DNA sequence: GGGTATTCGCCGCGTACCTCTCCTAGCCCGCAAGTATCCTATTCCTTGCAGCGGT
């Protein structure tokens, strides 16, 4: 059996540009299903929550 | 047990005299390694503007 499990698109953060979250802010707009971030710690949650 | 045999480690190896040379280690300072910072050039990257082409 095959299970459609494509690799994630190009998402990255870098402070070089004016808008660092450009790949994320465009990927989240053009995705129709859900999306689930997965963090390893609790404080890391806030490090991704802000 | 218990006697024989092989091995091992200590003790020993002349008296008196004469000449010569040579006898230093430990600590303080400045070097190295790592780490951290500031400071000053020096390159690199991003965005905004002047000139040129398409309509």
Radius of gyration of chain A (CA): 14
Q: Which residue is nearest to nucleotide B45 (CA to C1')?
A: A16
Is residue A6 within 8 Å of residue A12, measured between CB atoms? no
- Whether A7 sits with its Cβ under 7 A from any strand B atom: the answer reads no
3-class secondary structure per residue, A1-50: CCCCCCCCCCCCCCCCCCCCCHHHHHHCCCCCCCCCCCCCCCHHHHHHHC
Cβ-based neighbours of A26, under 8 Å, separated by 6 or more: none
This entry's atomic model was obtained through cryo-EM
Resolution as reported, in Å: 3.3
Q: How far is the CA of A18 from the C1' of B52 (A)?
A: 29
Contact A37, A48 (CB under 8 A): yes
């Amino acid at each position: 059996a095959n299970l459609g499990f494509q690799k994630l698109p190009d998402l990255a953060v870098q402070a070089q540009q004016k808008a660092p979250l450009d790949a994320l802010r465009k990927f989240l707009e053009t995705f129709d299903g859900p999306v689930v971030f997965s963090v390893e710690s609790e404080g890391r949650r806030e490090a991704l929550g802000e």
